[PDB]
Amino acid sequence: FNILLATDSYKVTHYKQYPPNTSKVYSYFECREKKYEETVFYGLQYILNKYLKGKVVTKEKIQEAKDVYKEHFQDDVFNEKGWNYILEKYDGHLPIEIKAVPEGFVIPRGNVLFTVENTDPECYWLTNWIETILVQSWYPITVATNSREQKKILAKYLLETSGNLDGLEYKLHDFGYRGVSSQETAGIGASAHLVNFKGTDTVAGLALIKKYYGTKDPVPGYSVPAAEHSTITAWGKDHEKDAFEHIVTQFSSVPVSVVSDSYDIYNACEKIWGEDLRHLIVSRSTQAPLIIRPDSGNPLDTVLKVLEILGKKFPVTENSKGYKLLPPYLRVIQGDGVDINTLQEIVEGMKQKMWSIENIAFGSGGGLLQKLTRDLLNCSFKCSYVVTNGLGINVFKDPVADPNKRSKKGRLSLHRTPAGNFVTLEEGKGDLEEYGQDLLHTVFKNGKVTKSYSFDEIRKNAQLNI
Amino acid sequence: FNILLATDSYKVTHYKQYPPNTSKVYSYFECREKVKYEETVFYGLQYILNKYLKGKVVTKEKIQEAKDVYKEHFQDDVFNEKGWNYILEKYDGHLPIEIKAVPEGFVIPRGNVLFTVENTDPECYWLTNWIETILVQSWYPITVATNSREQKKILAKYLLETSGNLDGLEYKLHDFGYRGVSSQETAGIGASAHLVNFKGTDTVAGLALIKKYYGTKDPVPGYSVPAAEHSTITAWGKDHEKDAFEHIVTQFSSVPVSVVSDSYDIYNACEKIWGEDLRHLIVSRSTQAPLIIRPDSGNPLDTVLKVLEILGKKFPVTENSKGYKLLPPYLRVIQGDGVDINTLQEIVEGMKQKMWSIENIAFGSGGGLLQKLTRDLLNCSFKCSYVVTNGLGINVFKDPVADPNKRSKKGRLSLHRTPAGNFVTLEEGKGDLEEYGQDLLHTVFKNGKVTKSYSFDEIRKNAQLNI
Ligand SMILES: O=C(NCc1cccnc1)Nc1ccc(CNC(=O)c2ccc(CN3CCNCC3)cc2)cc1
Ligand SMILES: O=C(NCc1cccnc1)Nc1ccc(CNC(=O)c2ccc(CN3CCNCC3)cc2)cc1
C-alpha cells in the first residue's frame, strides 16, 4: 500500500491552491442533517492502524508516486519536496492530529465526529490529502447505524409480540459476503453489523475485529449449518425430500437452516415438512430447531403463507402477549429482499396477522452491506478553520441552492450536556469548558495510534435504551 | 488472506449435504434476464484468479486457523479439515478446480453463461461451491463496467448528434467516486472497471490494479486535470472567492483547470467573478489549457442550463458544423454532482433541447458510478447446473414456483455466437454437437494456475461501442 497514491488525483494539485502563508488546515467529519436521527461512530481505528500509522512515506513510494502522476497529469505537479520533508524531518510519519468521539458512541446528526489538522505548518496540504481515506469511514458508520436501526425495529416488534427481547442479537443475520463490492468491504461491513448483532455468515468480519479491535469471547460472531440450492438441487428434482431428510439427519443436534423454495416452497411446507418428514421435525430439540427458509417471491406474502401452512400442520400456542407461536423445534428465516424497509413491512404484517416475532429471523445480504451510500447519513469532510499569515480564520461553505451543504465554522469540540445530550461547539467556544471537557479524544498524532477501543467497549456504547 | 476463511459460513457445512458418492459439482455464472441493461461487460475475473485463487492457497497454518475459528463460530466441529488437508497433501495447496470464462471485455447479452467452475478431483466435489462467494464478487466490476458503458452509449449518441464526431468521448465521464466507495480495494476494482470504457479518473487506486493485474501499452490507463476543491476556495475566506479563483488559474495557466464555483453562489461566480472581475484571465487561456467551471449543488440540469445561459451572455458563443451552440475554446463546464445514468440522460437531453453542444460539458460521478450498484441490478447469479453422483451425470437446476426469473440452467453449458451474430447458451451438454461452432468460454484457471490472461487494451477493444 502507498498512501501517496491513495487520494483523489486533484488533491495532488491542492498544495499550490491554498492561500500563500497557510500554516494550518483544520477539517472535520460529520453526518450532516437532511429517519436516521443518530449515528454509530465506527471504523476509524481500522483506517488509522491499517493505512495511516508508522513510516507510511519512503523514498520508493515518493519515486513511484512521482512516476505515476507525471504520466497521470501529463505535467510534474506532484509535491516531491513536501513528501520528502515528511520523510526527512519525521521519518515517514504523518505530522497529523485526529481527535474523535469514542467508537461505538451514538451521536445525533449535525455533530462533529472527528477532526484532522497538520501538526507541522509545512504539511498544511496534508490535512485534506488524507480526506479520501478518512471519508471512507462513512461505510462502517452507515452499516453500523442502519444495522442498529433494524435492531430498534426488531426490539419494538419482538418486545410487543412476545414480552421480552430474548434472542434479539440473532434476529438479523449477515448474508452479504457475495453481494459486496470486494473482500475488504466484506470485512469492514460485516464487522460494522457485528457492533449490534452476533450472527454473520461473512467470516471476513471476524478476522478484522480480532486484528484491529479484539473481544474477550474467542469469536465476535456466530453461525448455524445451512443448505443452499446447490445442496438441495444436487439430489435431483425428484429427490428434494431425500435432500431435506439427509440434511436434517446430518445436523440433528444443532439448529439447521434448510432452503425450501428450490421448486415449490408451498408444497415443501405442506407435503414434505408438514407430512412426509413431519416425524423428523417434531422430534427436534428447542436448542436445535429446523429453520425453514423461503428465498423467492414477495417477502411479506411468502412469510405469511409459510406461517399459515406450518400453523395448520404443527401445534401453535398463544403466548403471554396473545400472539401465535410455532412449536420450539420449528422456526422461519426471511433472507430474500430484506433491507430496513421490507424488514419493517414484514414485522408489521406479522403483528397484524397475530404472529409473534419469536417465529422469525431475517437474513440480509446486499440490503445490509451494499445498498448504502455516503449520501444516506450525509457524511461530510470539510475544512472549518485555517491559519494564514499567523491569523486564524473560520472557513465554511454555504452554496446558495443547497442550505443542507452549509458546513461548521472554526475549531470544533463535542460536549455532553447537563441533560445527557450532545452539543457541537463552533469557533473555539469549547475552550471555555462551559459543558465540561471535549469528548473528541486524540486517537492519532505524528504517525501513532494514541487511543484504542476493543469491540467489547464499542458494542457497549452502541447499546439500545430498551 | 486465507481462502478457508473467505467463504459464506454455511459453505463450511455443505460437504455433508450433497448426495453421497458425488464426484463432480459444476456451476456457472450468469446475469439473469428480467434503464434496461440488455447486455453486460465481462470484466474482473482475472483480478480474483490472480489475487486470491492461484498458487499454494492452503498451508498447515491456514488449516489450523480456519479449524480454530469455525469450532467457536459454529459451537460444533463441522470444518472439513480432512478435505482441506487433501489439497495440501496431493496438490501442494493448489485448487483442483477448472474455470472457463468468456474473454474479458466481451459484451454478452443477459441470460448467458459468463463462466463455469468444476472440480478436477472427485474428492473436491465440495470445492466448486466453496469458492462461490469469492467468484460472485465479480458482479461488482461486471456491473461498474456495464453501467459505465451504458453512460458512454448516451454520451456517444449526444456528442455525435450535437457535434458530428465522438472527439473527447473517453474523457466525458470522470471518476470522482474514490471517497464514496466502501473500501480501498473496492475503489481500485471500481475505478479499473470504469477505465474499461473511459480514460478519465481521480480514483488513483485503479491505475495500480490495471498495471498489476492486466497491463497496458500506455504508461497509465487513466488521466486527470488539476482541480480545486471547497477547502482551497473557502480557505481564503468568504470575501476572497475572487482571490482564490485568480491564484488557482494563475498557478495552472498552461494546463486545463477545474474550479469549484458554488462555494457561496454559483450564478454570481459565473456572472460577476468569472464574467466581469476575472474575465481577462480566462479569454487569455490556451485551447489546450481551458477553464472548466465546476458547479457542485442544486438541481443538476437546472444549474447546468442557468450556468450555460450565464457564460453565453459573458463570453463569445460560436456555432459548430451541426448548428449547436459552443462556448469559446478556453471555457468548459463539469457537472460533478448528482450524476448517475438517469441525471446524465436528462442533462444531455436538456442541453440538446437548448441547442447546446455536448462538447461544452464533461461529467463527474462518485456514488452513482462506483457505489449505488447492487448484485440485483444485473441479477448476477452463480448456480450449480451439473452433478455426477455414483457415476451418473444429472442436469441439476432450481425453478421457484413464485419466481420464473430465478430459474437456473440445466447440465453442462456452452456459449456460442450464431451465424446472425446472436448469442446462445446451449444447456444439457448440447454444445458437444459442433452445430453453432466453437464455444466462446476458455479455460482461464486450471489446478491452481492461470491458463489464459488478457491485457487491459484487449478488454478495451472488446468493450468498444458499435458507434
Ligand atoms: O439461513 C442461513 N444461511 C443460509 C445463507 C447463508 C449465507 C448466504 N445466504 C444464505 N443461516 C441461518 C442463520 C441464522 C438464523 C437465525 N437463527 C435462528 O433462526 C435460530 C432460532 C432458534 C435457535 C434455538 N435457540 C438457541 C438457544 N436459545 C434459544 C433459541 C437457533 C437458531 C437462521 C438461518
Ligand atoms: O472536476 C474535477 N475535479 C474535482 C473533483 C475531483 C474528485 C472528486 N470530486 C471532485 N476534475 C476534472 C477532471 C476531468 C475533467 C474532464 N476534462 C475536461 O473538461 C477537459 C476539456 C478540454 C481539454 C483540452 N483538450 C483540447 C484538445 N486535446 C485534448 C485536450 C482538457 C480537458 C473535468 C474536471
Side-chain angles (χ1 to χ4, degrees), chain B residues 354-371:
Chain B
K354 276 287 156 179
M355 292 307 278
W356 287 99
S357 182
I358 303 307
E359 297 161 270
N360 286 303
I361 199 157
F363 298 90
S365 180
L369 189 79
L370 291 199
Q371 183 63 21

Side-chain angles (χ1 to χ4, degrees), chain A residues 134-151:
Chain A
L134 290 176
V135 160
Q136 286 192 0
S137 60
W138 74 263
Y139 183 61
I141 292 163
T142 314
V143 177
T145 303
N146 193 53
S147 166
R148 193 174 173 276
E149 282 310 288
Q150 299 180 82
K151 192 176 173 184

Side-chain angles (χ1 to χ4, degrees), chain A residues 30-324:
Chain A
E30 86 162 312
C31 293
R32 252 166 53 249
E33 298 191 25
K34 202 173 250 157
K35 197 163 186 295
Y36 297 94
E37 282 104 314
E38 50 183 23
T39 62
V40 182
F41 187 73
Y42 174 75
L44 180 60
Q45 187 160 304
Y46 169 83
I47 298 169
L48 304 179
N49 282 294
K50 199 191 180 67
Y51 299 125
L52 307 165
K53 74 165 184 191
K55 174 172 191 172
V56 297
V57 185
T58 75
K59 201 155 166 69
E60 303 121 281
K61 282 169 191 311
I62 303 168
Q63 194 53 42
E64 185 192 26
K66 176 173 171 83
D67 297 324
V68 163
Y69 293 132
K70 169 84 198 80
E71 304 299 314
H72 191 66
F73 291 94
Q74 300 281 315
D75 203 49
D76 215 315
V77 201
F78 175 71
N79 189 11
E80 184 182 21
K81 298 175 167 213
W83 281 113
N84 273 97
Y85 177 80
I86 292 166
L87 178 59
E88 292 163 347
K89 197 113 199 297
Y90 293 102
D91 175 44
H93 294 66
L94 301 165
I96 275 292
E97 201 176 344
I98 305 151
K99 310 213 191 171
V101 66
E103 285 200 22
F105 258 57
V106 181
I107 311 304
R109 303 273 291 268
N111 261 313
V112 55
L113 298 185
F114 71 87
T115 57
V116 191
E117 50 185 312
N118 52 300
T119 48
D120 183 286
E122 305 295 292
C123 313
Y124 61 95
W125 55 266
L126 184 59
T127 312
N128 279 36
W129 176 283
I130 56 161
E131 154 160 29
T132 309
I133 205 138
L134 290 176
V135 160
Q136 286 192 0
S137 60
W138 74 263
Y139 183 61
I141 292 163
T142 314
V143 177
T145 303
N146 193 53
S147 166
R148 193 174 173 276
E149 282 310 288
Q150 299 180 82
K151 192 176 173 184
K152 277 194 209 163
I153 296 163
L154 290 159
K156 189 192 134 56
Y157 282 82
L158 182 63
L159 187 83
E160 201 148 6
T161 67
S162 76
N164 50 62
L165 292 157
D166 274 358
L168 176 60
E169 65 281 6
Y170 297 95
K171 288 293 185 198
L172 192 55
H173 199 90
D174 186 331
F175 291 177
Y177 213 160
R178 76 194 59 164
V180 300
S181 51
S182 71
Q183 289 291 133
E184 206 199 347
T185 289
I188 306 166
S191 74
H193 171 70
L194 286 172
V195 178
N196 318 289
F197 294 97
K198 309 205 79 193
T200 188
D201 250 64
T202 310
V203 179
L206 308 187
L208 189 156
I209 301 173
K210 163 79 202 178
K211 193 163 189 183
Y212 298 97
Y213 289 99
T215 49
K216 281 175 213 167
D217 304 309
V219 291
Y222 308 94
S223 207
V224 304
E228 85 184 359
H229 303 94
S230 93
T231 66
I232 310 283
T233 72
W235 291 69
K237 184 158 189 154
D238 321 310
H239 313 289
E240 186 196 23
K241 182 183 82 211
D242 287 11
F244 280 16
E245 170 149 27
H246 178 77
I247 290 153
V248 306
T249 306
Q250 287 276 78
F251 306 101
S252 48
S253 307
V254 289
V256 61
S257 172
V258 184
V259 69
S260 319
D261 88 313
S262 309
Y263 313 101
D264 198 328
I265 177 63
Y266 309 112
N267 173 263
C269 293
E270 219 188 77
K271 248 270 183 163
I272 324 209
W273 294 128
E275 294 162 19
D276 301 338
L277 303 173
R278 198 185 173 264
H279 65 284
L280 298 182
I281 313 309
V282 305
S283 66
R284 302 189 65 101
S285 170
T286 293
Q287 303 308 295
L290 162 77
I291 323 152
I292 286 175
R293 184 158 96 78
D295 190 45
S296 61
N298 184 270
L300 171 67
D301 292 353
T302 305
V303 158
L304 296 176
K305 238 284 195 72
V306 163
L307 286 163
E308 170 188 77
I309 296 155
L310 303 184
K312 285 162 156 71
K313 316 297 287 198
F314 291 88
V316 167
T317 61
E318 189 168 288
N319 64 11
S320 55
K321 298 291 144 285
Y323 289 86
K324 295 200 260 179

Side-chain angles (χ1 to χ4, degrees), chain B residues 297-327:
Chain B
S297 57
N299 183 277
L301 168 68
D302 287 9
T303 308
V304 160
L305 287 181
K306 196 161 181 198
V307 169
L308 287 168
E309 227 62 67
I310 296 166
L311 302 176
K313 278 296 185 297
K314 292 289 151 169
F315 300 86
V317 153
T318 46
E319 193 181 288
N320 67 32
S321 60
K322 288 281 298 291
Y324 287 83
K325 279 193 266 165
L326 189 82
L327 283 164

